[PDB]
Design a protein around this ligand. Structure first.
Ligand SMILES: [Zn+2]
Lengths: 159, 65, 198, 96, 171, 82, 52
RNA sequence: AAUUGUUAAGUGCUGAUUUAACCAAUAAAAAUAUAAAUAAUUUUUAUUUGUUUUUAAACACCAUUAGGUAUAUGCAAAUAUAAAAUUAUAGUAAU
């Protein structure tokens, strides 16, 4: 992934959030960029209540992961569009996607010994792992799991 | 009249010591005489922001909170 | 560096500091044990003094060791008859002699010109067989208490001491939660009361 | 270093130029009657009078308050140079 | 060291304590999806009818406030000037003297009698590390028939940055 | 000096013994038995490495290897000269 | 760290202790000791004056 | 391992906790080591002081309870980091 954003948005109506995401995608595509992915993560209750433009503390918020491939000047344009949006309370810019964290400030001998195509070609869920994600889930995809998981409920149906 | 943000938080944070629904006084009620106007970031607890427990200048020289 | 890095550098310098380990309390503990052994073994005439301080002055003072080396001091400042209870500093086979050190007027000249001391002797062999080369460890006073009869008043101490104790009380009551977290996970702060600093 | 503040919790500006320029020259604060005629539908959602200044030279949409008419005018032309509705000025000369 | 004794049934377990394990509401729901975990899972479990007592001890003052589950101030903050160890003890005792009929009035307006047998559920939180901390909580300890304290904790400020401190503290 | 400072950590008991002269492996829930060995070792002016097994990244490897060197599962354990 | 528990007692202040030592102690022994100390100081000053 | 970041980052001034801090710019790159100055005339991260007035709400300080003063950001001036050259002092009384 070239760039990723975690958009925290106000839980408005469906049409307002749809228009906000549509304007964000239009600003991405008009500057000559590509959307790798956009995923909605539902409404969760954060540990800190963000304030909107009219200084109202919001208890709930919607999280959206946005993975993009854009040029850096155009990414600055889209970031200035996103950070000045009325519905976006907070959005961090994941700029450590091509190079992993700890290489630049870590060991000096282990600085040019990495491969950027290892991290650039995979998605953001394969770089920053979720708690439900693990290596055995990745090995299950290449092991022909359809012919093996058909017998996993043969003991629980009778009890 | 201006500056509501300067005495208040950027984002409402809730400490673990005040859980749940942290006790916040009403902003219309004024504080005590000669008291200290501390921002809502560098406060130890919201009970310390009560107008009767608002620390003054002479209490600041003796007690920290 | 800027102001922030300089403040963090001097904070790390004061936090992680190598102190000078000078074995002074073990020296005084060995001297206390030797004085107690001398007071137990031999009957000592006090002469309007405390017997502990009298045996201390007769053992470890400068005219006592100079009388051991031979100076013709006034009247017998050191103990004459001691066997294995004699301190190893003033043994006959030891490598430190104050008659050789009296011609040097500076400690640097003593460190420069004097010979290295003799490591092993017969009295050193007897103290090795007795295990008296290092004093025994006392009861640990680090974590039990400080049991004392009275407490000093604020009028007895200096006004600078009162101001300093007020500053210690302020910064202790302010940041008592700002301790190392591996000790803070066991301290029950609901019962802790700091009443005063003297 | 430099300290910053966020205008309407969105627009990160530097603190010195905010007290001189950025804060008192916003549309919603300095011209509240003009900012009440802001068009909420045709304008972009990342553009609103809480962050857009007085001298925004690019034309934005304005919803007129006397008549129901939307038009495009610059924000500096509306506030500094002095602007109004094009249908209201063509009805003003028609009446008198 | 020694394990606590065994309970064999919930019917007399309800009589052994002031609560019961088996709920009588009989909550019938079908949430096949995974449940939503709380933000603060490792915390005291605060029931809605619990009074939060705040005891702020200082050098020459001790304050006692009582808040509800939602943050509503029940009684005004008692000051020694308005009304030491004995100072905090008398302030907390005269606050708990007047806290009972105001609690009965505020709970009888909704439908809670709180007349006989039911003790006021209390959570005590202390500030200060002073001598008045000693006498205040003791003034809650003799009220065991009236105020049942479940969570005795403290609310002590962590000095994150601090605006500034006066000159006598530094120099 | 020539290398930036770094905290030592190891998953094996043998690297702790070969590095330090006096190593002690304690727990945070036992402060009295830890502080008594702190008084005895510092009385003889001996450099000592105290390893708190609370909040360590190799607790389960080190709790197994301390059971093999000392048959009793009691902490703290003093290790001098391997 | 000094544990108190309410059982340990404070000492007397400075001025009350000085007034108690001025009120209780006998005047004759302190007076003759001060006179002997004054004569010792005068003898020391005279011996310093004698050496040229 | 450090400096700067406004148009780039983190940001309540990262140093309260903590010997460890994302990202962006910066680690080397003419001949000669004997060669008789092969080099430049620049900058300030630190301390004060100025620059503007409903134009810091606060916190702190001097007149005693209320006024002003500054303080942090934006710029700016002065001084300073660092040995050597040049001139002189030999003995003090403390914890
Ligand atoms: Zn019109």
């Amino acid at each position: 992934v070239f760039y990723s954003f975690v958009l925290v948005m106000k839980p408005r109506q469906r049409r307002f959030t749809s228009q906000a995401l549509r304007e964000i995608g239009v600003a991405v595509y008009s500057n000559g960029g590509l959307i790798r992915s956009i995923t909605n993560e539902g409404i969760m209750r954060p540990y800190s209540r963000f304030r909107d433009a009219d200084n109202t503390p919001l208890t709930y918020a919607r999280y959206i992961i946005l993975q993009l491939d854009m040029g850096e000047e155009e990414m600055g344009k889209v970031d200035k569009i996103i950070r000045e949006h009325q519905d976006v309370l907070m959005a961090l810019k994941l700029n450590n996607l091509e190079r992993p964290v700890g290489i630049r400030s870590g060991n000096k001998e282990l600085q040019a010994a990495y491969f950027p195509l290892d991290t650039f070609t995979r998605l953001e869920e394969e770089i920053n792992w979720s708690p439900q994600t693990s290596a055995d889930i990745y090995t299950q995809l290449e092991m022909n799991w359809k012919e093996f998981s058909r017998t996993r409920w043969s003991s629980f149906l009778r009890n | 009249r201006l500056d509501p943000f300067f005495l208040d938080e950027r984002e409402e944070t809730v400490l673990p010591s005040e859980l749940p629904n942290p006790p916040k006084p009403d902003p219309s009620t004024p504080l005590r005489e000669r008291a200290l106007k501390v921002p809502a970031q560098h406060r130890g607890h919201w009970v310390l922001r009560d107008p009767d427990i608002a620390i003054t200048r002479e209490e600041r020289r003796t007690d920290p909170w | 560096v800027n102001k922030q890095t300089q403040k963090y550098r001097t904070k790390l310098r004061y936090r992680f500091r190598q102190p000078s380990v000078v074995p002074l309390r073990q020296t005084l503990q060995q001297r206390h044990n030797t004085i107690l052994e001398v007071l137990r073994r031999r009957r000592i005439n006090s002469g309007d003094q405390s017997p502990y301080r009298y045996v201390e002055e007769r053992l470890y003072s400068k005219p006592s060791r100079l009388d051991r080396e031979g100076v013709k001091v006034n009247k017998t400042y050191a103990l004459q008859g001691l066997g294995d209870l004699e301190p190893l500093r003033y043994g006959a086979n030891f490598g430190i002699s104050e008659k050789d050190a009296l011609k040097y007027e500076t400690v640097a000249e003593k460190a420069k010109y004097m010979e290295p001391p003799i490591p092993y002797s017969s009295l050193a062999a007897r103290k090795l067989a007795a295990g008296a080369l290092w004093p025994a460890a006392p009861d640990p006073e680090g974590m039990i208490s400080k049991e004392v009869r009275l407490l000093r008043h604020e009028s007895s101490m200096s006004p600078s001491a009162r101001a300093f104790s007020e500053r210690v009380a302020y910064h202790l009551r302010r940041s008592l939660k700002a301790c190392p977290g591996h000790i803070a996970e066991h301290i029950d702060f609901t019962q802790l009361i700091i009443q005063e600093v003297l | 270093k430099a300290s910053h503040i966020r205008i309407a919790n969105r627009k990160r500006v530097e603190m010195f130029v905010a007290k001189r320029f950025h804060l008192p020259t916003r549309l919603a604060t300095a011209a509240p009657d003009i900012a009440a005629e802001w068009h909420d539908e045709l304008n972009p959602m990342h553009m609103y009078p809480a962050i857009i200044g007085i001298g925004h030279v690019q034309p934005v949409w304005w919803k007129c308050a006397i008549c129901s008419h939307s038009y495009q005018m610059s924000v500096e032309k509306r506030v500094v140079r002095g602007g109004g509705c094009p249908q209201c000025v063509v009805n003003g000369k028609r009446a008198v | 060291a020694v394990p606590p004794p065994r309970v064999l049934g919930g019917d007399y377990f309800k009589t052994r304590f002031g609560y019961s394990l088996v709920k009588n509401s009989e909550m019938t729901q079908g949430p096949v999806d995974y449940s939503q975990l709380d933000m603060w899972g490792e915390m005291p479990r605060y029931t809605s009818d619990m009074v939060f007592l705040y005891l702020v001890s200082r050098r020459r003052n001790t304050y006692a406030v009582a808040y509800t589950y939602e943050g509503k101030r029940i009684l005004n903050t008692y000051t020694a000037g308005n009304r030491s160890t004995d100072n905090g003890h008398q302030v907390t005792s005269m606050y708990l003297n007047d806290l009972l009929p105001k609690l009965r009035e505020m709970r009888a307006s909704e439908g809670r009698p709180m007349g006989r047998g039911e003790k006021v559920e209390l959570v005590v939180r202390v500030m200060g590390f002073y001598n008045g901390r000693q006498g205040a909580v003791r003034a809650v300890q003799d009220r065991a028939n009236e105020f049942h304290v479940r969570y005795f904790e403290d609310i002590t400020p962590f000095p994150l940055n601090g605006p500034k401190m006066p000159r006598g503290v530094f120099k | 000096s020539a290398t930036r400072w770094l905290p030592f950590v190891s998953s094996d008991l043998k690297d702790y013994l070969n590095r330090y002269w006096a190593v002690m492996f304690t727990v945070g829930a036992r402060p009295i038995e830890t502080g008594h060995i702190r008084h005895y070792v510092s009385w003889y002016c001996t450099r000592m490495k105290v390893v708190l097994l609370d909040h360590h990244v190799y607790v389960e490897p080190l709790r197994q290897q301390l059971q093999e060197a000392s048959r009793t599962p009691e902490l703290p354990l003093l290790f001098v000269n391997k | 760290w000094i544990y108190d528990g309410g059982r340990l007692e404070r000492e007397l202040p400075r001025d009350v202790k000085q007034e108690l030592q001025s009120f209780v102690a006998d005047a004759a022994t302190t007076l003759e000791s001060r006179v002997k100390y004054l004569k010792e100081l005068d003898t020391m000053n005279q011996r310093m004056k004698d050496i040229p």
